[PDB]
Amino acid sequence: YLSSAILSTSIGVLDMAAAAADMAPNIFGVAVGGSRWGGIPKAIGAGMS
Amino acid sequence: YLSSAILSTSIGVLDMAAAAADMAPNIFGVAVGGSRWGGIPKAIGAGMSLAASATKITADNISQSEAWRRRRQEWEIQKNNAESEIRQIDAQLEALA
Amino acid sequence: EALSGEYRSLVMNNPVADRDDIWRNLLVDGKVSAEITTTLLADAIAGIQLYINRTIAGDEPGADSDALERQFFKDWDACNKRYSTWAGVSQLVYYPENFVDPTLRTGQTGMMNTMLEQLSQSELNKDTLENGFRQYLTAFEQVADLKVVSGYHDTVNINQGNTWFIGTSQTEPKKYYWRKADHSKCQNGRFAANAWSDWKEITCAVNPYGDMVRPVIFHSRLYLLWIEKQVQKDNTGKDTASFTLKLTHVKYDGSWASPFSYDITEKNISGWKKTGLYCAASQEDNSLLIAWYQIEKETQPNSFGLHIQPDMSCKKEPNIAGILATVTHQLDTETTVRVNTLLNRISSFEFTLEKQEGNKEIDLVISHGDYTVKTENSISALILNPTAYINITPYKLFSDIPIAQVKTISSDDISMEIELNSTKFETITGSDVGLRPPLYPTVSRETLAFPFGKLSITIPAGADINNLDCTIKVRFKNTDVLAATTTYKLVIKKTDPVQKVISLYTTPDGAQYMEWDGYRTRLNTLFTRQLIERANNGIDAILSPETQYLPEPKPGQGTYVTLILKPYDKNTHGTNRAFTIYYSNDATGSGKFPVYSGSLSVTDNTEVKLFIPLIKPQDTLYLNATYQKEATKQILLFRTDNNPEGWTLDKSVNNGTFAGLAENGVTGLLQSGEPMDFSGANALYFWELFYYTPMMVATRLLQEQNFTEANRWLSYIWQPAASGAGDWRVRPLKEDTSWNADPLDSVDPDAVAQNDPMHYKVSTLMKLLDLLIARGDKAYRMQERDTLNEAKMWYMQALGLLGDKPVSIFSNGWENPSLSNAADKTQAKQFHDEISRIRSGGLLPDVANTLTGLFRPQQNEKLLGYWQMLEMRLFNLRN
Amino acid sequence: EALSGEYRSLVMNNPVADRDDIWRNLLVDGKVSAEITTTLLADAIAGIQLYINRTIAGDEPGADSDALERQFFKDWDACNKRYSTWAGVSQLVYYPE
Amino acid sequence: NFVDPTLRTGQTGMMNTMLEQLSQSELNKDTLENGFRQYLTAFEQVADL
Amino acid sequence: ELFYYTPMMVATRLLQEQNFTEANRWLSYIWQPAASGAGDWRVRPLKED
Amino acid sequence: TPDGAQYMEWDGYRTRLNTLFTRQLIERANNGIDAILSPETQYLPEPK
Amino acid sequence: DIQALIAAEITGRLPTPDVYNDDNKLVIPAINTGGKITFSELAKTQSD
Amino acid sequence: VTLADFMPMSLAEIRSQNTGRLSREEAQLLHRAAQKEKQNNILYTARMLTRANPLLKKEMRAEKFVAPGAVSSMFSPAGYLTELYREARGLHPKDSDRNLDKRRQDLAKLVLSQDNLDNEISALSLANEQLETALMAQTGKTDKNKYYETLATSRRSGVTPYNAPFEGIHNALAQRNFVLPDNILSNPAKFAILAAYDAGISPKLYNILTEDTESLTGSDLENSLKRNFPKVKIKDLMTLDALANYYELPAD
């Protein structure tokens, strides 16, 4: 149970790094964009959960 | 419970293959792109959460089996109580004879 | 009561004293009732224990503080305070099997942990017992397939410190792991099996580009580091590719921090091809020198640098092609992979221990904690330690307030006065510290400390930095009445240890190895590429000794050599029985590398087998030997062709003998393959799979009373042979393989039993005795006639296993010595001296009386418990 | 007790031998009390079982290793060692129901 | 007489979560060190601010 | 917290659950008897009130 | 400060806001709890 | 139990109460390496 | 030889001996080398001793193994006591008044025999022997009974005026539940002394309690204080704890 709780709190870092990586645009060319504006609030919420 | 824990840890592979497949661009043409930059950290996290879930499942499995073992120990104590009460009642019947 | 009153009235000369003061002064309690009976040794023990407690708690002033700061008293409360824990701790070196638990072990891998987790239920049928093992084996296969990507060496001398490795998995995506090879457990190019850590996973999402990952130790903390390439497209049609440097580290709880990122793409790394990155910490200006460079046949045609402060802020190093110029031996090329070491200091400091010391009563020695030079000035950190012990004449000696000297305040008493090339700069502690070490604790031999705070000593000017930078000296003075001075010389000098290269290779047939100065250490193992075929036949085929003898390609280019040596002759070997055999290339005078050390045998040939690497890039090799007499003559080993196993037996005109082998037996020169190694890098995984897993499953089935399957699982380890001795089916037990060189640095039985696997033999047989006695008891409680015969059967089997009860001698050489004659320091010194003599093989023994000193070795009370239990049960069966 | 002493003095030609060596050499226990009753087939069975255990554990040197590497002895501990599991395993071909 | 070494007013969340994880019955050196490494991670983060 | 309240908590938490040889190890991070008369306080703000 | 220290400087005083303890604890922490909690850790210096 | 006899005869007071009454000699055993018992006798002159 | 003499010593001892010879880093290197050699030697002996394991005799210096509980066993209370003594006898200087040998002179002469380890004695008897061997050394008398006879009249502490014989009489006599001043067979003119002995009072204690201290002044009071407090200083006795310890009565 202790290892499970520690694993469950040691994943917010990854979930927030994922959102920070998603904030960068991924569509290039004549139309640019693709960032995920709500990625960081969503990831803070996922870390809270 | 054991099969459940094993299923819960044998899915990180799929969840990470999904993210690795998502890292490839899916929008082509004049605008190219569509990769999912956070796919791989998100999938590592999802695998961690599955390991935590399966760890709690196997903890519950061990707790269950231990509850049953303590139950059997109570039962052995009760069986010895009654088994010695039989000997006592037989000695009592001999005293009565 | 009356005697006590009169005692403290007459002897103690203090009639008002409490009666407990007699207890504290005489180490005996008088207030006991007349029924409290104790032995006489036990009363002596209780007395000396009370004495040690009172003198360690300060109630007996005047104690030897130096003696109280000694391992026996340092481990006082934990171990030596009570006879219970002293005996229990002392028995742990001799009978670790009494404390070894086959389930819980220190350093148990996560794989074994999760398998024990899944065997921790009560219903262990063959289905769960095989599913657990298949899952363990999947995890084992993954951790055995790891190939090493890159490394980083901790210190600057590659014979010390640790080497961090980064291994990747043979999956997709790749999973990155890290180890550590402690070189402080590495003699003769041979890592102790416990010098290696476990492969530990890097949970961050590391997605390098072109296999550029680098570990680096930055402020004692492991940092990972990789370069990430990401394909983009301009607003115009052109499609670029952006590069990012990512940098993360382990947090204290073993998780990995979220990686920082630095945009790297500047018009040129996009243009390189086959690049590689470099990373090393700095002993000066604590930072991280990172540098990506182009690769060609030669290293670093172009290279861009970067400095990183501990606040993790970019600071572009503008001229790094000059810094990479000095460490080009650590940089990758198109064909080699080399591990980096930390950056050398530009100027190595040296401190002559003394010039003069003045008053030879206070030792007055200093110690330069840290030292470096800034852009223009040399900073240092100093601590000063005097004696300050008893016999400061005259005496009072009642009280110390913190014709004679200063018993009062010691303000500004100590001072350092560095002497520069012509000038000097004199700083006194009254200008640094408000903390004053008091002469109290007046109790003797207490030394004091005077810490100085980061003495930024300004300034070296007009001096060639650093060509003639040897400042004359650094002198300080504990100026006080009856106090002295000492001086030290600063010998800064620019040095350059060149081309101490440590590289990683991968043979065409799969083997990896780290090749450092003159040795090769195999990093990975090809066991899993061959286990895969055994594994279809089942656990019985995976765990059979044929799996444990599986071959392994030889690391790189070189030859195996099986040197056979004659027994000890006093003429050819000198006096000492030890021998070490070297090899060289050999441009005689080019240095030779010790490849094996050992104790040469008496009345028997000793056979030492090696692997002599070919590093020099007729490939010559020259083997020696070194005895107490002298170092023998070389022996050529060469080859004419490019055959991998072809190395000429009995090379040219040289005799082909050291005079220590003097036989036709040298060869062992073929066999491109050696067996699987149980004391190398992957020793832990092999030992788990082949011993610790069956022992765990067997002890886990014995509990929960599955005897017919506990026996099946123990028979994977030991199995009785038709001949006398048993058939050990675990290879490292069959050929006693020590795989823990330093086992007494911790109170754990597994380290001792790993250092000496005969304890694992005894532990296994004790589990078997457990099993047989439990089967006997189970059949003996089903009280019918045939089951009673079966129970007698199981007990007789356990008795036959145990053997013949050892008779306990009582008429023995044990005189009844006095305590003082039993507790001599000469008695311990002579013992340890003879052992250390006979251990280095200084000569043969005296022939052979005493091995353990004054007190005799004891029989294992656990074995005697087995003996007594079997005798009791057999008595009840016979009656 | 007296017969055993004289036995190992005269027959075994080793008067210093332990009395259990008579047990190991003659496949019968003499130290039993006078109340331990067994049948005669059962004593023959216990004797041959002790013999097979001792020769399979190497205490009876000179055995035929080729014969010891035979299915009956390979399945010795699991099935054929005790009458219980020999009978239970033999019945499994005839009455699997 | 009234100070309780476990419950204190103004106790940080770090100390709260460490006491949480030491509140079981099996306090062997492994859990006792894992708890302290985790406390120390949180402490390091709140000290770097 | 780090230097006093954490060892006191772990020591009182090992004293309960009766781990005496480790409760003593953890109290000896705070106070440790000195060869001189007075004890050796190993927490700086206690050593200098 | 260039060496890491922060401080709020108000009318005529300075109050140190942060601490550089963690940049030096990191090296003690590898030796274990016994080295983290020893008084030498508590005397660690701090830029002015 | 026979070792207790041998030990009390080699160090203690056995045979009770006196010894040496065999033509002014004395033969006392000596056990060693747990697996042997060796002998070593004494003698005396015609005093008294 | 060299590294064998520094095995028992600590780093501070090594640093403190030959302060002029050993450096402060040479001493640390030597201490590490000594401890490592000690560990390796202990491992060597343990490894050679575990070859003699009865379970491994089928696969094989089997010199001497003693039963558990034997006094010669290296894990016995005798070995524990040897370790304690070797480590404790050198904590205070030999001239110091707290030295272990000097404060317990019977320890160095203590013989580690099986009979010492096994035989049970009364702890109180051992305390009393320890006190007697010092009190008779002070007095100079070697006879125990002559010493107690001198002890029967002396008043040099608040518990001292006691008779071994009279206490025996009184205990033996009160064990018969016999009341002296209620005998038909006595001198009714000696009822006072008889009831005193009944309460239990040594003849010397009676001589003490019958003096006429009230209304006694002059040099006679000096005489009486020198008689009734021969060894204590009255001013040092004045305090409450001193009065509680002199008469062995509770302070409260």
Author numbering:
A (entry chain E): 2083 to 2131
B (entry chain D): 2083 to 2179
C (entry chain A): 921 to 1322, 1447 to 1661, 1674 to 1903, 1906 to 1937
D (entry chain E): 921 to 1017
E (entry chain B): 1018 to 1066
F (entry chain B): 1744 to 1792
G (entry chain B): 1551 to 1598
H (entry chain E): 292 to 339
Article excerpt on this structure:
We chose Mm-TcdA4 from the opportunistic human pathogen M. morganii to investigate the heparin/HS-toxin interaction in more detail. Since synthetic heparins/HSs are difficult to produce in the large amounts needed for biophysical and structural studies, we decided to work with natural ~15 kDa porcine intestinal mucosa heparin instead, regardless of its heterogeneity. We obtained BLI curves that show a rapid, concentration-dependent signal increase upon association and a signal decrease upon dissociation, indicating the tight interaction of Mm-TcdA4 and heparin. To identify which domains of Mm-TcdA4 are involved in heparin/HS binding, we determined the structure of Mm-TcdA4 in complex with porcine intestinal mucosa heparin using single particle cryo-EM. However, we identified additional densities at the periphery of the shell domain of each protomer. The density occupies a cleft that is predominantly formed by positively charged residues (R194, R195, K243, K265, R266, and R886), representing an ideal binding site for negatively charged heparins. This shows that unexpectedly heparins do not interact with an RBD or the neuraminidase-like domain at the tip of the shell, but directly with the α-helical domain of the shell. Although the resolution of the density does not allow to build an atomic model in this region, we flexibly fitted several heparin oligosaccharides that resemble natural heparin into the density. Indeed, most of them fit well and their negatively charged residues are involved in many potential electrostatic interactions at the interface. The heparin/HS binding site in the α-helical shell domain of Mm-TcdA4 is 10 nm away from the membrane if the Tc toxin is in the prepore conformation and attaches perpendicularly to the membrane.
